[PDB]
């Protein structure tokens, strides 16, 4: 069905542009990451990782 639009129509009858983002928060090698820097690695010492 055609879906015609006009400027005279009231709110709720006007076009709305939609974009949806879907992520994959599971256990696998990561590919898309936020911009945070990486420090060095320390072993045999109690730390926060």
């Amino acid at each position: 069905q055609s879906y015609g639009f006009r400027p005279t129509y009231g709110v709720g009858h006007q076009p709305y542009r939609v974009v949806v983002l879907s992520f994959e928060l599971l256990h696998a090698p990561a590919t898309v990451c936020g911009p945070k820097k990486s420090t060095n690695l320390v072993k045999n010492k109690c730390v926060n990782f």
């Binding site: 639009f5 709720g12 006007q14 076009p15 709305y16 542009r17 939609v18 949806v20 879907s22 898309v32």
Partner: protein, 49 residues
């Protein structure tokens, strides 16, 4: 990350959500009940009319 783009009517914007029903969530675009992500909808009456 997956980005899906389209355009709809205003009163149908509420149909883009998990576990919905209508003419858009049945024959056009369906979201799983365990959705993990975001949606972004904005008015575009200046361009799409």
């Amino acid at each position: 990350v997956y980005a899906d783009s389209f355009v709809i009517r205003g009163n149908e914007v509420s149909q883009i959500a998990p576990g919905q029903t209508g003419n858009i969530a049945d024959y056009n675009y369906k979201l799983p009940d365990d959705f993990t992500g975001c949606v972004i909808a904005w008015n575009s009456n200046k361009l799409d009319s």
